[PDB]
Amino acid sequence: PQFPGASAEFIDKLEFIQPNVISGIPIYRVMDRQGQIINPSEDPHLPKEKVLKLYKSMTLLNTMDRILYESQRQGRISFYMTNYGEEGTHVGSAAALDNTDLVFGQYREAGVLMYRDYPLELFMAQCYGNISDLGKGRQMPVHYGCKERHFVTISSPLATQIPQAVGAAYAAKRANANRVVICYFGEGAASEGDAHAGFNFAATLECPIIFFCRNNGYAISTPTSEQYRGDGIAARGPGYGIMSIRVDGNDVFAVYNATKEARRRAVAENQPFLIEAMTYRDHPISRLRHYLLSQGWWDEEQEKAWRKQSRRKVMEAFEQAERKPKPNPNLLFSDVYQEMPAQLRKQQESLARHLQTYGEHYPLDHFDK
Amino acid sequence: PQFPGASAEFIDKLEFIQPNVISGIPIYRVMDRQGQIINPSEDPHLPKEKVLKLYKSMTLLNTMDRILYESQRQGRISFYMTNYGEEGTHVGSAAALDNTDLVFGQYREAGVLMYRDYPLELFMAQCYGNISDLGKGRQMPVHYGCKERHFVTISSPLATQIPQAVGAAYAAKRANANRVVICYFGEGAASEGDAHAGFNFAATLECPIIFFCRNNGYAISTPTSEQYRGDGIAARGPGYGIMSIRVDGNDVFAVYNATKEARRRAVAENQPFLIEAMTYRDHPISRLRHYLLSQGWWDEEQEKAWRKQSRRKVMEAFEQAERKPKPNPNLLFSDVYQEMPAQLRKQQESLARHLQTYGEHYPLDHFDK
Amino acid sequence: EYGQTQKMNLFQSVTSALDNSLAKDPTAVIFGEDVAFGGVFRCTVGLRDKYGKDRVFNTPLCEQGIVGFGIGIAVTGATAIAEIQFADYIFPAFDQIVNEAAKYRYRSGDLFNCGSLTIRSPWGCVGHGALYHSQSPEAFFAHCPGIKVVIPRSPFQAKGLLLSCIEDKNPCIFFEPKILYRAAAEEVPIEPYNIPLSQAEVIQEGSDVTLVAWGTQVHVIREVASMAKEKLGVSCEVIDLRTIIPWDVDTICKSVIKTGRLLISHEAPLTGGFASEISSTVQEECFLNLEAPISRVCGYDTPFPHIFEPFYIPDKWKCYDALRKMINY
Amino acid sequence: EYGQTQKMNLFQSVTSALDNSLAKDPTAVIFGEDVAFGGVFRCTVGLRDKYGKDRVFNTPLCEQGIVGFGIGIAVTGATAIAEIQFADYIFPAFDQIVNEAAKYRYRSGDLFNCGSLTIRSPWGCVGHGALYHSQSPEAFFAHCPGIKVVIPRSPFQAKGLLLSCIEDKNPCIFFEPKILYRAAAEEVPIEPYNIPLSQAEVIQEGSDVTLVAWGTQVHVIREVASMAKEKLGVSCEVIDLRTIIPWDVDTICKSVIKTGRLLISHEAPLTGGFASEISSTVQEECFLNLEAPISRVCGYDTPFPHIFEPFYIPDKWKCYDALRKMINY
Ligand SMILES: Cc1ncc(C[n+]2csc(CCOP(=O)(O)OP(=O)(O)O)c2C)c(N)n1
Ligand SMILES: Cc1ncc(C[n+]2csc(CCOP(=O)(O)OP(=O)(O)O)c2C)c(N)n1
Ligand SMILES: [Cl-]
Ligand SMILES: [Cl-]
Ligand SMILES: [K+]
Ligand SMILES: [K+]
Ligand SMILES: [K+]
Ligand SMILES: [K+]
Ligand SMILES: [Mn+2]
Ligand SMILES: [Mn+2]
């Protein structure tokens, strides 16, 4: 055949190509449910200090989740999204990145920030929208962002970050400084048009990006049977020309290995990689705990002391966060554009005049002045 | 593994899944370049009358193209899109449909209408925007539509028809009357978000639809190397759970066979099928002509007489179309909503008043009154 | 007046409309994200069990697909009631709404249409929704000939307007004020009834000033009328616009010819907001009657903030102060 | 004033701006559908050969991707100049523009931004473009705080405004009137120069009436000024708005305080069109000066038709007749 659109032979018999969904792409695993290494040639043999850091980051995240989830139940904060079941995918992949690799995500990615030593005070400041929040209290809780830790601010519209992450990866390529971009999203978000945009552009424009899809079988109430009919998201990668793998999201080492190799090859080859990590909506923390014990790297006394200390650190941050004032209400007007248009300043002055007269009717008590 | 998102085994070794683009999905062919049947078990053995109708529909389309393309070059009509190279994909697939199957498309689908006996007068009326145009002269040329022949009016925004065709297919399923929907689009249009929407919805919602992608290697100036990096569009179907095939678009019989089988199974099984037909931006007319000759079903005298008669019929329609007036300018206001809002009627009255006073400055000469 | 009623909040009134629709129209289907289990705001509770999984069903998470799919159902003549989970997430579908749904009938010379489409979506502020759980997008749609945009103020109004949208032969967007979903109930007829589209409602007669709003903001202006009467001895005519487009120009102009003053209020940002269209039109038609400049009391020209919401919204004090100044112009 | 000039039509002036940008900003890239070979309107001819395939390149056919990709480039600080092939096809990107680009700086507290993005797109009627080759979408964007929308009237203005957009630290949409691409040339400086954003230009002083328009419609109102002077002895002040948002309120209000009459014109449909925002604002600020109702002479509230275009557009006779009536009010 002589068609520029595809490289292929002729066939003289009519045969439709059938999807293989019943036996899909297999799920890569490094350690079993008892924390045992299954195949020694795949063991990354991470040193004890780093593995303890993976474990403490996961558990600290889990401690923070418990407390802020309760805070939400009481209306102390307006909203919360937990990380339960996603601690290993995020901590394990973050550990495989270079500290300056740029991260785009959404609602399940706090563990990346935790691994990058984001202060508990700042997670809280964002949820409370208090004066310490660098986001100036403008977004809903858990909409975290950190310029110093290369974690691009979350936004509620699903999948919009995917083609943006590809653009940042293209710019990184041009800048030539050995950086990857990683982009996290759920299996629900992968149904958006923007996912098809980002996957395709990353391949045709040859971008050093890792797409990290978390597939936990549900998008709110919708099971994956109503979300897609192919073999999950991993089976989509090859149709875009993207190298693809599926991993056990309860296995921090499998996540680490796959992300480390994707990062190495994405940066060297300027091509996208897709990792689909399977999780539940047999936990990553338990599994790593079993592993630590086998190595003689943890025990019940250490577990108790850390549980105690992590609760103390989170409660200290929690209490301070609740006691800080909210930002000055003037801050509602800045950063709409870099400068403030004259007409916008007029509106800001109109609010200042209004509060002068009717201020008793506003909760000024709580806001910086 | 116990993950609801995918059905798969574990694997204990890290292995990325690689796309197979160099040897892609093979291209189904029934007859060679000399019009010879390659594999007798695949010959549809269509009767002489139907095969002559395929040939005359293609050539008549080609005759009309030549004339209207020249008309466009002279500014007699404002715009034109030809069907060159796409005569076989459209005539061959149309022949495999039931006359009441609903067709969505865009700019390359006039042959479907031609096969369905759309009058030459009406193709012309749309291009000229004259009083005979059922579209009332509102859209650019070649934006054809026919309710009686179940061909949904074309619109310029690429790929928007794809999720709509899926919706019409869902509605057909519910209505239970053994109808398919077919949806045509190019390989460029397949990059749109709406293509990912329609493919996915058709699979999860189990819709009796044929997606017919024409891949001619180019979208305006853009070669497919800049459009995608997987194995064309056919290789995308399996990732959505869609049964998929690639065919030789210069081979009317291969197109016919694939569309006939896709239609049979889509309606029986309520599942989508994707056909990717490879064309050039070795012609379908020449190839079928060679076939007719081998059968003793055509010869040079018949070819001459038909060339003459088809030119005459198109020129008769062309001349009549140019001489008809354009529709009443009042028609610019109707059908915006089913009824006319009072405020819109006010605007229509404002134009009538304006023309009463300033009419000499408008080309009223040409418009119905 | 309308048969037996029962107390319903706004989400229940929506379910009642949808149920009545499915009962009387065998073609009708309801679809969108998470509609099957009853929806994130409970508007479709019970309907799948009652009418069948082929009629009340979840789609993949893809708004441009939801609307394109809905248009396709409507092209065959079947009633398509699409849900977009928050109005904030309607934008991925903007091209399918503006370029496709709105233009479908016109561009085909009425050979094809999607009149049997209705898109319903939660709308407006909710106390803590911030940038993407709060938006009021009606002005974006107001500039698009060929769609209708309708916004109710209460459960009784929601069911009557939604039934009219579903039955209207044009693609309709119906925005449901989410802060009212579980607010106070009122009596709502159990059987179907319609409230006409493109018809404002004067809910309180007045002689000194006309106040216009829609959605939850109608309740704000009702209160402002009360404050103005008590504090200023000023008599306000309070009007719920109800349909954004095509809008009831005559009812608004008639009121302003009587009062000579107009104040329009909406949660959406001032600039390019729908108040600008009403103001400009009233100015054209009522010019010689205007005693004072028409005032617009709207959201600021910013994204919708989380912690600053109490300071952002055009509340009753903002409306009252504007009114005071206008009465004194 | 600006160094050596040469005659350029509007497409050539755009190429000149882009070339100057790439020359002086090593980060800058240009991308979109069919830009590599020079573009369907020839705006990028020569640039890929001059600056390299990594800097001037084609994307897949996917507008929501083009804008999302552009935003991502800009998030790293690099200048991203995206093309959308016709403004009519900007809608697939509406969510990326409105929900993402416009809100990027605000929602992050200025930790991240996409100020270095500019989206350029052909705009406005072209004689036979019909529904999808003709649209003027500026009002849809005007209701979105956080983006700027800019529309030039000539080659000199295009290059100066486009350079300002590219350099402005906010995401800008720059609409190029396609009917002017190969219309008359004028002298345009070869070297870079800027024209300020959010600044209207009074191109002709007048005392009896203010006329406001943008894009090609500026030429229409210039002619209307001439007709009014010759036929009515009426002196018109002619103003090109140039930036749709943030718009130059002061220059327009100052002119109307002087003249006491205002007529605004645009190709876009009347309802929800940007004329409504100007009218409502001028009415608020200039109320006591208004001798006559502010008039809006716009496209009708329909999709943009093919064969009926000559009857659809707010041409010089439509503008003149409105002006005559206003002068006589
Ligand atoms: C464009 C858009 N539509 C809908 C939503 C509402 N929504 C918030 S989370 C969610 C489910 C997301 O599922 P998935 O991507 O699988 O992530 P998971 O919650 O399972 O981690 C939905 C529909 C949204 N935020 N954005
Ligand atoms: C949303 C949108 N973007 C861009 C265009 C401009 N456009 C008209 S045809 C075309 C190329 C289409 O390519 P393909 O789908 O491969 O069809 P082909 O022309 O090759 O038959 C483009 C970009 C359009 N009509 N709609
Ligand atoms: Cl959300
Ligand atoms: Cl086009
Ligand atoms: K997002
Ligand atoms: K289309
Ligand atoms: K309807
Ligand atoms: K910019
Ligand atoms: Mn999920
Ligand atoms: Mn093509």
Coordinates of C-alpha atoms in Angstrom, one line a residue, chain C residues 24 188 195 273 324:
Chain C
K24 CA -46.5 11.5 29.6
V188 CA -46.4 22.5 44.3
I195 CA -45.6 28.6 33.2
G273 CA -23.7 40.8 32.5
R324 CA -31.2 55.0 48.3

